[PDB]
Amino acid sequence: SKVCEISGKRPIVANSIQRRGKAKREGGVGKKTTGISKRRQYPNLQKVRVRVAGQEITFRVAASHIPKVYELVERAKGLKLEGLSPKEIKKELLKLL
Amino acid sequence: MKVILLEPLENLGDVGQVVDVKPGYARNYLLPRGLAVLATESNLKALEARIRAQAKRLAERKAEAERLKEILENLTLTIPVRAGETKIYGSVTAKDIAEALSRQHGVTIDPKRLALEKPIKELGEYVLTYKPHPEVPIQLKVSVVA
RNA sequence: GAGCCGGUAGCGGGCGUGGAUCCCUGGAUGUCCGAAUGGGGGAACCCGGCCGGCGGGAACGCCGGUCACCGCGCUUUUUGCGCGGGGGGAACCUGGGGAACUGAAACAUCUCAGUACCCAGAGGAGAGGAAAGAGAAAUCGACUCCCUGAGUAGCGGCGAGCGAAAGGGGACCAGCCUAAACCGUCCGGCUUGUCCGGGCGGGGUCGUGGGGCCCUCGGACACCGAAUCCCCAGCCUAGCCGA
RNA sequence: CGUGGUUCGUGGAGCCAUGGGGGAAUCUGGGCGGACCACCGCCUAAGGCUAAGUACUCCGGGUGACCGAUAGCGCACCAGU
RNA sequence: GGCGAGCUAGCCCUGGCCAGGGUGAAGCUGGGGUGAGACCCAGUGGAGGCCCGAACCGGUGGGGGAUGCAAACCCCUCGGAUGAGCUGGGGCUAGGAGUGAAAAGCUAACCGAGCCCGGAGAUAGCUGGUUCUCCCCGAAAUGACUUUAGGGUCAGCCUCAG
RNA sequence: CAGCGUAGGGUUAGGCGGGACCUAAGGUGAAGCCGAAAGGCGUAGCCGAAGGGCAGCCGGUUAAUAUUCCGGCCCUUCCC
RNA sequence: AGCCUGGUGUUGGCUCUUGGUCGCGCCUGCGUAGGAUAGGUGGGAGCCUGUGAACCCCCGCCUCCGGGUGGGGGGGAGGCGCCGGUGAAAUACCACCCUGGCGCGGCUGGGGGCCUAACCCUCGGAUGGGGGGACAGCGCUUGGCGGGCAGUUUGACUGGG
RNA sequence: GAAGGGGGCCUGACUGCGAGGCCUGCAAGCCGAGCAGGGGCGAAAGCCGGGCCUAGUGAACCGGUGGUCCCGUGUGGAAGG
RNA sequence: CGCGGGGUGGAGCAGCCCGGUAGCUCGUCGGGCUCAUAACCCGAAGGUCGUCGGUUCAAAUCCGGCCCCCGCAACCA
Ligand SMILES: [Mg+2]
Ligand SMILES: [Mg+2]
Ligand SMILES: [Mg+2]
Ligand SMILES: [Mg+2]
Ligand SMILES: [Mg+2]
Ligand SMILES: [Mg+2]
Ligand SMILES: [Mg+2]
Ligand SMILES: [Mg+2]
Ligand SMILES: [Mg+2]
Ligand SMILES: [Mg+2]
Ligand SMILES: [Mg+2]
Ligand SMILES: [Mg+2]
Ligand SMILES: [Mg+2]
Ligand SMILES: [Mg+2]
Ligand SMILES: [Mg+2]
Ligand SMILES: [Mg+2]
Ligand SMILES: [Mg+2]
Ligand SMILES: [Mg+2]
Ligand SMILES: [Mg+2]
Ligand SMILES: [Mg+2]
Ligand SMILES: [Mg+2]
Ligand SMILES: [Mg+2]
Ligand SMILES: [Mg+2]
Ligand SMILES: [Mg+2]
Ligand SMILES: [Mg+2]
Ligand SMILES: [Mg+2]
Ligand SMILES: [Mg+2]
Ligand SMILES: [Mg+2]
Ligand SMILES: [Mg+2]
Ligand SMILES: [Mg+2]
Ligand SMILES: [Mg+2]
Ligand SMILES: [Mg+2]
Ligand SMILES: [Mg+2]
Ligand SMILES: [Mg+2]
Ligand SMILES: [Mg+2]
Ligand SMILES: [Mg+2]
Ligand SMILES: [Mg+2]
Ligand SMILES: [Mg+2]
Ligand SMILES: [Mg+2]
Ligand SMILES: [Mg+2]
Ligand SMILES: [Mg+2]
Ligand SMILES: [Mg+2]
Ligand SMILES: [Mg+2]
Ligand SMILES: [Mg+2]
Ligand SMILES: [Mg+2]
Ligand SMILES: [Mg+2]
Ligand SMILES: [Mg+2]
Ligand SMILES: [Mg+2]
Ligand SMILES: [Mg+2]
Ligand SMILES: [Mg+2]
Ligand SMILES: [Mg+2]
Ligand SMILES: [Mg+2]
Ligand SMILES: [Mg+2]
Ligand SMILES: [Mg+2]
Ligand SMILES: [Mg+2]
Ligand SMILES: [Mg+2]
Ligand SMILES: [Mg+2]
Ligand SMILES: [Mg+2]
Ligand SMILES: [Mg+2]
Ligand SMILES: [Mg+2]
Ligand SMILES: [Mg+2]
Ligand SMILES: [Mg+2]
Ligand SMILES: [Mg+2]
Ligand SMILES: [Mg+2]
Ligand SMILES: [Mg+2]
Ligand SMILES: [Mg+2]
Ligand SMILES: [Mg+2]
Ligand SMILES: [Mg+2]
Ligand SMILES: [Mg+2]
Ligand SMILES: [Mg+2]
Ligand SMILES: [Mg+2]
Ligand SMILES: [Mg+2]
Ligand SMILES: [Mg+2]
Ligand SMILES: [Mg+2]
Ligand SMILES: [Mg+2]
Ligand SMILES: [Mg+2]
Ligand SMILES: [Mg+2]
Ligand SMILES: [Mg+2]
Ligand SMILES: [Mg+2]
Ligand SMILES: [Mg+2]
Ligand SMILES: [Mg+2]
Ligand SMILES: [Mg+2]
Ligand SMILES: [Mg+2]
Ligand SMILES: [Mg+2]
Ligand SMILES: [Mg+2]
Ligand SMILES: [Mg+2]
Ligand SMILES: [Mg+2]
Ligand SMILES: [Mg+2]
Ligand SMILES: [Mg+2]
Ligand SMILES: [Mg+2]
Ligand SMILES: [Mg+2]
Ligand SMILES: [Mg+2]
Ligand SMILES: [Mg+2]
Ligand SMILES: [Mg+2]
Ligand SMILES: [Mg+2]
Ligand SMILES: [Mg+2]
Ligand SMILES: [Mg+2]
Ligand SMILES: [Mg+2]
Ligand SMILES: [Mg+2]
Ligand SMILES: [Mg+2]
Ligand SMILES: [Mg+2]
Ligand SMILES: [Mg+2]
Ligand SMILES: [Mg+2]
Ligand SMILES: [Mg+2]
Ligand SMILES: [Mg+2]
Ligand SMILES: [Mg+2]
Ligand SMILES: [Mg+2]
Ligand SMILES: [Mg+2]
Ligand SMILES: [Mg+2]
Ligand SMILES: [Mg+2]
Ligand SMILES: [Mg+2]
Ligand SMILES: [Mg+2]
Ligand SMILES: [Mg+2]
Ligand SMILES: [Mg+2]
Ligand SMILES: [Mg+2]
Ligand SMILES: [Mg+2]
Ligand SMILES: [Mg+2]
Ligand SMILES: [Mg+2]
Ligand SMILES: [Mg+2]
Ligand SMILES: [Mg+2]
Ligand SMILES: [Mg+2]
Ligand SMILES: [Mg+2]
Ligand SMILES: [Mg+2]
Ligand SMILES: [Mg+2]
Ligand SMILES: [Mg+2]
Ligand SMILES: [Mg+2]
Ligand SMILES: [Mg+2]
Ligand SMILES: [Mg+2]
Ligand SMILES: [Mg+2]
Ligand SMILES: [Mg+2]
Ligand SMILES: [Mg+2]
Ligand SMILES: [Mg+2]
Ligand SMILES: [Mg+2]
Ligand SMILES: [Mg+2]
Ligand SMILES: [Mg+2]
Ligand SMILES: [Mg+2]
Ligand SMILES: [Mg+2]
Ligand SMILES: [Mg+2]
Ligand SMILES: [Mg+2]
Ligand SMILES: [Mg+2]
Ligand SMILES: [Mg+2]
Ligand SMILES: [Mg+2]
Ligand SMILES: [Mg+2]
Ligand SMILES: [Mg+2]
Ligand SMILES: [Mg+2]
Ligand SMILES: [Mg+2]
Ligand SMILES: [Mg+2]
Structure with missing residues (x-):
């Protein structure tokens, strides 16, 4: 559940690569790798x-799609x-189709 | 980011000036305080609609005077009063100049705000002025007998 | 089509040409546990609400029915109703995660390997699929699969080792729906309007670019036609004749 | 910028994917042909579905220069006992 | 990747258990003492990881046992025995993890890293083993290099064909 | 002969124990929070006992059961 | 792993204060020496002033305090140079620039204070109040410390090692 | 009978090769006549491809530097080889 | 090899800016106070100012070539 409620961005797995040289x-002999870890x-x-x-509504979103929340807030039409x-x-109200 | 103001501020503009500001400011102050709204493609459209509405029902109000200015600024009404001599026993008030014109040419006016200041006594040829905004000077003759 | 009441004889009885046992199809019944779903719980036990019934029957007990949760849709947040989900399956499939021994005759990059395994999901298959593709031929035309290209091109402590694609030959064969412009409509918000927004319908779907809108031509009986519905043949689930 | 995928282990490193930052345009628009630029071409991204050819064998069947009770399934026998 | 705290360790909740005897702290009361006190003496009292010693919890020394009665026992002897005590029942914590008044102890009779299934036919330059018959020939235990020295690569020496 | 083979018999409750009572550690868990998936937390509530609560004592009887059957005396709750 | 750390996202308001770069504006500079307290080199018989000069008086800054220099003004027609020279240079002016300084604007950077409204804490009471506060937390990224943990390496010959 | 000492000019401490051999498990290491180019010293014959000789040394890989033709991922370049 | 500084006399070392003193301390010598030496006072020694060439009237200055010592920072088949 560390996932964006709007874009659906969720944590991914990536390698940390230790290079030296x-x-x-x-003009170097080239780079060398001293470790790769997840x-x-x-x-x-x-x-x-x-x-x-x-009501007060709270979205958990990626900072990137914050704008989308307020756009989703513009669409108003009867709902108590x-x-x-x-x-x-x-x-x-996102893409529906 | 650009927002539509819903109020004068000092620090920005007023009542409709699309001005851009820090999105932080917008989200956590203006918008929440009704202080304004986002320059949406929709909201922006609805604003032009807003501007045209006024500019129409306003330039129409001026097209109501410039019209009622012409039918009035040249035609003259007569006020026959028990004048005795150069000093009316009664007195023609703005309220009167109203009733008069209503038949003497058949139009209706204020009759308030006419630059009446104190009911008019005595006789002669008077030139007053009218309203609203860019206005018209009405001319009328106070006469004598019945 | 003459025997039968399982393995299983026996004791003690019965059934069958008025067609039994047996075989196939459909239906009925189907305690309790189990996703287990009224609530508990140490599975196969225990304890309830509501409506109805049974006993002399209020207390008690039994019988039938009904009552978990979650999602979607209607709908008046009412409160309901309808629909669905849940769990399982030899291997196969996709996705989310993801080792080490070992190999490198040590070892860390590399290897083993995206393997083993864990998790989610799907279905008789799954994935993929109708070019923002290939890649030097003014070329080919979705995807999948096999042969080949090829241990090539390349990758690589350039070590160990890893290892494509185009093209050609085959199997199969298919192509479609939308979003938007535009139009109609219902509705909601309001700082009432050739306003904004949501909902449905029409419209439109393309790469010799396509579509919308305007005008002109002539715009049609047609002509193509399902992956959907319907019928039928054929096939499976018992059998029969057979020198 | 950080990584994954590809034969590509940072390599001249493109292409496809995307965790972070910035952030367009609508045919005179955009992506690609292995850094980059020009030229010449290819293709139209950010919505979706799509039979068949393919994979497997709990299950039924048919075959065997397959076994024949220390074999063959762990089990020919009331054995996952 | 799962299975284990029904053994053992610690902790949490709720219960239970500790014959009998001994020593006699404070306080209290009274008396003496003083300016008033401290304080002293009696009696009372009944404290304590206090004493002796069963149950109970232990495991000191010796003997026995050693294909045992017993995969930790038996006899004699010995330690604690109101406390940091013992103990029933109900719970929680685990595999690079727990728990440990600390021994690398214990975590289901072998723990310097539990068990089970799996990767898996790990790898093993080491050890062992490698099955009918006859015929011909027939070595080596050296050199070079080797994280090489009981392993290899090339050469040397055997054999077969042309 | 047997705790062994075959067969037959034998366990009787409103009051004893447990349940149509209570809560404890802990467990579970509407609300809610968190996590790639599996899942981890968690207020109330619920589950959870050798604790709390609650009404039976003395005899007789069977080859084998008895505060259970019987006899005597004595109580609990529910319904009307 | 953990921990420290710069940039950046979440992340806003108001101010004061500064730096870099750029454009423009105005000053900046000393060796007797030429008559002097002329920065490099050009152009330069011309000028400057009656679009009010020198001579003075308040004024600010610079100073090798010698003077340099404008503003206010009394001021009312002069005020400079070449020339001549004990000096690389000539010193009206129009210039392009150097060094450094202030000034104005521009694109960016640094700091400090205050605010609240995100974010955090808290208040039997919440559409709210109080506290902290654009910090902290958290995302991406930088560099560092890092047996707490992990994977390994740690040669052969050798009268045994 | 110089390989030792002295002086004069010079730079063959050459380029392109190399018959044939030494040594040798491989890979290396070593000697080398002769031809060609263009030279040096010498009247010349001739000698000269470092040093009286035998130690003064390091496979490959990965890169740096200067050249040069060569390849340059549709094409011209460029990147990189 | 890359970037930044400079050596001034016997020593470190200011002058490196807006081209112009080629300085200060200790050491040694001379001289006086000190019963004394040191302290302490007076004066004085030594610089083509790392190398050469430049732009200016010169210059330690600015440029440039140059050289090592020190300074900084990577890489190592
Ligand atoms: Mg990294
Ligand atoms: Mg290069
Ligand atoms: Mg690895
Ligand atoms: Mg952004
Ligand atoms: Mg039977
Ligand atoms: Mg019979
Ligand atoms: Mg009969
Ligand atoms: Mg029949
Ligand atoms: Mg049936
Ligand atoms: Mg049925
Ligand atoms: Mg149930
Ligand atoms: Mg009933
Ligand atoms: Mg029922
Ligand atoms: Mg389903
Ligand atoms: Mg399933
Ligand atoms: Mg499941
Ligand atoms: Mg996967
Ligand atoms: Mg997978
Ligand atoms: Mg998933
Ligand atoms: Mg993965
Ligand atoms: Mg490994
Ligand atoms: Mg191998
Ligand atoms: Mg190995
Ligand atoms: Mg090995
Ligand atoms: Mg090893
Ligand atoms: Mg791999
Ligand atoms: Mg499954
Ligand atoms: Mg099929
Ligand atoms: Mg399919
Ligand atoms: Mg699909
Ligand atoms: Mg398409
Ligand atoms: Mg096409
Ligand atoms: Mg290479
Ligand atoms: Mg691979
Ligand atoms: Mg092909
Ligand atoms: Mg083909
Ligand atoms: Mg086709
Ligand atoms: Mg509308
Ligand atoms: Mg529509
Ligand atoms: Mg439509
Ligand atoms: Mg349509
Ligand atoms: Mg067009
Ligand atoms: Mg027959
Ligand atoms: Mg026959
Ligand atoms: Mg990237
Ligand atoms: Mg990669
Ligand atoms: Mg590499
Ligand atoms: Mg490369
Ligand atoms: Mg790449
Ligand atoms: Mg890559
Ligand atoms: Mg490109
Ligand atoms: Mg990309
Ligand atoms: Mg991205
Ligand atoms: Mg185009
Ligand atoms: Mg392409
Ligand atoms: Mg190209
Ligand atoms: Mg680039
Ligand atoms: Mg293309
Ligand atoms: Mg599409
Ligand atoms: Mg499909
Ligand atoms: Mg079969
Ligand atoms: Mg047979
Ligand atoms: Mg047998
Ligand atoms: Mg067998
Ligand atoms: Mg046999
Ligand atoms: Mg089987
Ligand atoms: Mg067997
Ligand atoms: Mg069986
Ligand atoms: Mg595990
Ligand atoms: Mg235990
Ligand atoms: Mg007792
Ligand atoms: Mg006692
Ligand atoms: Mg007393
Ligand atoms: Mg007394
Ligand atoms: Mg006593
Ligand atoms: Mg006492
Ligand atoms: Mg004691
Ligand atoms: Mg004792
Ligand atoms: Mg004792
Ligand atoms: Mg004792
Ligand atoms: Mg004793
Ligand atoms: Mg003992
Ligand atoms: Mg002992
Ligand atoms: Mg002993
Ligand atoms: Mg003994
Ligand atoms: Mg013994
Ligand atoms: Mg013995
Ligand atoms: Mg004892
Ligand atoms: Mg205690
Ligand atoms: Mg206990
Ligand atoms: Mg372990
Ligand atoms: Mg531990
Ligand atoms: Mg202990
Ligand atoms: Mg043990
Ligand atoms: Mg393996
Ligand atoms: Mg090994
Ligand atoms: Mg022979
Ligand atoms: Mg012989
Ligand atoms: Mg060996
Ligand atoms: Mg050999
Ligand atoms: Mg022969
Ligand atoms: Mg018996
Ligand atoms: Mg009774
Ligand atoms: Mg009893
Ligand atoms: Mg009870
Ligand atoms: Mg009841
Ligand atoms: Mg309860
Ligand atoms: Mg839980
Ligand atoms: Mg959960
Ligand atoms: Mg979930
Ligand atoms: Mg209960
Ligand atoms: Mg109880
Ligand atoms: Mg009790
Ligand atoms: Mg009771
Ligand atoms: Mg009684
Ligand atoms: Mg008995
Ligand atoms: Mg009795
Ligand atoms: Mg009785
Ligand atoms: Mg930071
Ligand atoms: Mg920030
Ligand atoms: Mg500034
Ligand atoms: Mg200028
Ligand atoms: Mg606050
Ligand atoms: Mg507040
Ligand atoms: Mg405050
Ligand atoms: Mg922050
Ligand atoms: Mg780091
Ligand atoms: Mg580091
Ligand atoms: Mg270690
Ligand atoms: Mg370390
Ligand atoms: Mg290893
Ligand atoms: Mg050794
Ligand atoms: Mg020896
Ligand atoms: Mg020896
Ligand atoms: Mg000589
Ligand atoms: Mg000579
Ligand atoms: Mg040769
Ligand atoms: Mg040699
Ligand atoms: Mg030599
Ligand atoms: Mg290598
Ligand atoms: Mg290279
Ligand atoms: Mg190279
Ligand atoms: Mg070329
Ligand atoms: Mg290409
Ligand atoms: Mg090219
Ligand atoms: Mg190169
Ligand atoms: Mg090159």
């Missing part, structure tokens, strides 16, 4: 509290439900 393109790369997840209808307006603001 002078580049070849700088690590996660998490999306830059942040909270976005935004007031909709009468529970703290679950996002259920409606969500994919219901």
